[PDB]
Amino acid sequence: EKLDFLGEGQFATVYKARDKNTNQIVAIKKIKLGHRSEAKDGINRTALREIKLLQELSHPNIIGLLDAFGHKSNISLVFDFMETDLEVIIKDNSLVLTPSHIKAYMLMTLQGLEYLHQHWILHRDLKPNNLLLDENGVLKLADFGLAKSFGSPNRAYTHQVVTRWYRAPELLFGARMYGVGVDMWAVGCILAELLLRVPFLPGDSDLDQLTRIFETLGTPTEEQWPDMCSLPDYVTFKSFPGIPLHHIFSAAGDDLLDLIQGLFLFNPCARITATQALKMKYFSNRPGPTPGCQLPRPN
Amino acid sequence: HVPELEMLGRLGYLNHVRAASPQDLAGGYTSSLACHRALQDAFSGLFW
Amino acid sequence: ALPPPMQYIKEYTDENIQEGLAPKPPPPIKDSYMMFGNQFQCDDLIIRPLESQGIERLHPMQFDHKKEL
Amino acid sequence: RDNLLGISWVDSSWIPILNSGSVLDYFSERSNPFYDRTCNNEVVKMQRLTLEHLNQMVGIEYILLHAQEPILFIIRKQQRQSPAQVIPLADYYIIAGVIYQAPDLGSVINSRVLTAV
Amino acid sequence: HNSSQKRHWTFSSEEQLARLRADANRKFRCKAVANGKVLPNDPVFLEPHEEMTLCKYYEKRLLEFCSVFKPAMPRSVVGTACMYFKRFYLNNSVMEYHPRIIMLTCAFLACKVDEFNVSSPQFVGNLRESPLGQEKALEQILEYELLLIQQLNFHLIVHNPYRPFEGFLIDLKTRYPILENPEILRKTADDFLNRIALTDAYLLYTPSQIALTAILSSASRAGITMESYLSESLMLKENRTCLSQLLDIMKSMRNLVKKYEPPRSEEVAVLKQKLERCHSAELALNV
């Protein structure tokens, strides 16, 4: 049964259609594939990663595959319905200031990241785009196709998967290995972008994002990140003085600014972990994170 | 359960089959993280 | 910000708290660059700086002020 | 930070550019000790042409209360629980481009009586 | 597995696996009887135990195919391909689908799940066939891949004993210095894991238990005593009872290895001819 078209995408098409199994309207995602190519991989590789990871993780802050149908050539995926994407709401001029709602979004993201990190899954790309908010207002990561698992035995690692607008310096420097800290850097960019309501760092690719990262935080010292010069892809930019976090984004939370600085630290080990962020004073503060019941809802 | 930081003889040993590579270390692959990754999969299940 | 209406009396007055003969003498005529207020106000300069510095000159060196005005 | 009642903050360069919304802006600056780098008033510096941020969702905000065009510009600090709900925290009054905190009745009387006794 | 999501799929007893294979073969036989093309208890129909023997020969052949794979092959990918084939065959009758084509589909899916991402033309290049046949085979792999995803029930992730075995070997060296030649013990443990992969014990037990069994087999082979390791294992949840349960599983695992034998070539040749006869008969799908 098809009730409505939730969104149009080349990779896959989203439909606001009630499930045949359940009368209540549910989010349905249908993969789009072409048999025209002489050589084909069958199910899309990104789609294959997204379906297995979604089945593996069951969490309030992680979207889950309730049911899926492979009997048809097309694959239909059943997910909890989400009222609107987070990115459109953020880019829209806020009617009021919602700092506790911003705190709630970050807390949900950290709890969801902690659950996948505990399962050992790594999310390669985190951004306001490809993020969905339900009527409940719980934050869920819509796409796990970007996410790639990492293992102790050496294996091929995807690079430049993270968005050009929000990319870790090590990924820009083409570091062979990736870490949980890279996800924290992406969360720090999202938190800074959330306060601004516009992307914190513009990325045009070709190391343009790396130049912007150097301009905002100053040039990283050799002590700040070990063997940065040793890495095969290394570029030296002009020695910018840097902008204090409370000048780029006017915000200077007593604990929020410290958390933002830890997320923006160049070294992954120095960068604050998701578990430390859960225990961070800013989250445990007199302002209370929104449960999502009072979260603003369009129409 | 196995801690992310061993804080034990395993952390003191600091030894891996691939040992330590400077290019790999800067990107990730901390010796404690690699040991923890193997231990968590090894300790998975083991009970009914 | 942090700064008040300027730091209060310090340094030279501390030196001045002496007796009979102990205080330092006056400074020499620094004939070079100084920093009064915020401007450098360095010495050795003219009265009317030539318009050639900073702008074009549409008037020849004859400059019979009365005729050119 | 010792006593907010006993602090005054100014900027002669800002004094020529001063009247109504200008006052809100000067207060909004940052370095003014009264202005908080946390709360909601920091996020209005981030927002643009906002016209109702204090109501629907709430928090610590600073709003002009009474204004005389040349010099007098009084500011009030409110903490809103919800739209149409206002709780006044304090009042900071700007005389001649000089910001002071409005003294309490009882606190001022008591301290000055202690000076007299 | 603490992550789980495969614990429901894993079957505790070998007898349960055998009954499931029998019902799947019987279901195909019942559908053929409903068609009326072939009578019940037809000679062409293949018994499930005979089908299992043919699968075991093919499982050994799949290991040979993985060894001759043109690109370097990850051990985890080899385990994933074998696991996918056995579960697909558990779900549906062996006679209905040719094992070699299903194994090629499983290997391609195994590379994608483990991020090996071998190219489909490169996989076709490793296979030796007529070029028109290779293109037809690639189309068959795509149709089988859709069927395999339905059989997987959207559970691509697999738990492999190799990763726990690496962790166990590191733990053994740090916990006790008594053991000697640990790297040689690791090599023998890996060989034991390969024998378990051929057996259905991989489905029967969790990967961590299989990895521990491989370490124990290596210690017995070298004559090293793991009684000190057993005492640290005894100091865990359930106390002594948990250790005793693990020892019972180890004894049952040895019994499974001794019971398993390489399939007779002559019987396999008869089974291959019968499988070809089943393929010669046409199901004709559904009208």
From Swiss-Prot, chain A:
Ubiquitous. GO terms for biological process: cell division; DNA repair; positive regulation of transcription by RNA polymerase II; protein stabilization; regulation of cell cycle; regulation of G1/S transition of mitotic cell cycle; snRNA transcription by RNA polymerase II; transcription by RNA polymerase II. ATP binds at L6, G7, E8, G9, Q10, F11, A12, T13, V14, K29. Residues 1-283 form the Protein kinase domain. Signal peptide: none annotated. The active site is at D125. It holds the Pfam family Pkinase. Its main location: nucleus. SMART domains: S_TKc. Belongs to the protein kinase superfamily. CMGC Ser/Thr protein kinase family. CDC2/CDKX subfamily. Serine/threonine kinase involved in cell cycle control and in RNA polymerase II-mediated RNA transcription. Cyclin-dependent kinases (CDKs) are activated by the binding to a cyclin and mediate the progression through the cell cycle. Each different complex controls a specific transition between 2 subsequent phases in the cell cycle. Required for both activation and complex formation of CDK1/cyclin-B during G2-M transition, and for activation of CDK2/cyclins during G1-S transition (but not complex formation). CDK7 is the catalytic subunit of the CDK-activating kinase (CAK) complex. This is Cyclin-dependent kinase 7. It comes from Homo sapiens. The lineage of its organism: Eukaryota, Metazoa, Chordata, Craniata, Vertebrata. The gene is CDK7.
Curated annotation (Swiss-Prot), chain C:
It comes from the Eukaryota. Constitutively sumoylated. It is found in: Nucleus. Belongs to the Mediator complex subunit 7 family. Component of the Mediator complex, which is composed of MED1, MED4, MED6, MED7, MED8, MED9, MED10, MED11, MED12, MED13, MED13L, MED14, MED15, MED16, MED17, MED18, MED19, MED20, MED21, MED22, MED23, MED24, MED25, MED26, MED27, MED29, MED30, MED31, CCNC, CDK8 and CDC2L6/CDK11. The MED12, MED13, CCNC and CDK8 subunits form a distinct module termed the CDK8 module. Mediator containing the CDK8 module is less active than Mediator lacking this module in supporting transcriptional activation. Component of the Mediator complex, a coactivator involved in the regulated transcription of nearly all RNA polymerase II-dependent genes. Mediator functions as a bridge to convey information from gene-specific regulatory proteins to the basal RNA polymerase II transcription machinery. Mediator is recruited to promoters by direct interactions with regulatory proteins and serves as a scaffold for the assembly of a functional preinitiation complex with RNA polymerase II and the general transcription factors. This is Mediator of RNA polymerase II transcription subunit 7. It comes from Homo sapiens. The gene is MED7. The chain holds residues 10 to 78 of 233 of the full protein.
UniProtKB/Swiss-Prot annotation, chain D:
Keywords: Acetylation, Activator, Isopeptide bond, Nucleus, Transcription, Transcription regulation, Ubl conjugation. Transmembrane segments: none annotated. GO terms for cellular component: core mediator complex; mediator complex; membrane; nucleoplasm; nucleus; ubiquitin ligase complex. The keyword Transcription regulation applies. One of its GO terms (biological process) is positive regulation of transcription by RNA polymerase II. It comes from the Eukaryota. One of its GO terms (molecular function) is DNA binding. It is found in: Nucleus. Component of the Mediator complex, which is composed of MED1, MED4, MED6, MED7, MED8, MED9, MED10, MED11, MED12, MED13, MED13L, MED14, MED15, MED16, MED17, MED18, MED19, MED20, MED21, MED22, MED23, MED24, MED25, MED26, MED27, MED29, MED30, MED31, CCNC, CDK8 and CDC2L6/CDK11. The MED12, MED13, CCNC and CDK8 subunits form a distinct module termed the CDK8 module. Mediator containing the CDK8 module is less active than Mediator lacking this module in supporting transcriptional activation. Belongs to the Mediator complex subunit 6 family. This is Mediator of RNA polymerase II transcription subunit 6. It comes from Homo sapiens (Human). The chain holds residues 7 to 123 of 246 of the full protein.
From Swiss-Prot, chain E:
Signal peptide: none annotated. GO terms for biological process: protein stabilization; regulation of G1/S transition of mitotic cell cycle; regulation of transcription by RNA polymerase II; transcription initiation at RNA polymerase II promoter. It comes from the Eukaryota. Its main location: nucleus. The modification Phosphoserine is found at S3, S130. Keywords: Cell cycle, Cyclin, Nucleus, Phosphoprotein, Transcription, Transcription regulation. GO terms for cellular component: CAK-ERCC2 complex; cyclin-dependent protein kinase holoenzyme complex; male germ cell nucleus; nucleoplasm; nucleus; transcription factor TFIIH core complex; transcription factor TFIIH holo complex; transcription factor TFIIK complex. Gene3D superfamilies: Cyclin-like (1.10.472.10). The keyword Signal does not apply. GO terms for molecular function: cyclin-dependent protein serine/threonine kinase regulator activity; kinase activity. It is found in: Nucleus. Associates primarily with CDK7 and MAT1 to form the CAK complex. CAK can further associate with the core-TFIIH to form the TFIIH basal transcription factor. Belongs to the cyclin family. Cyclin C subfamily. This is Cyclin-H. The gene is CCNH.
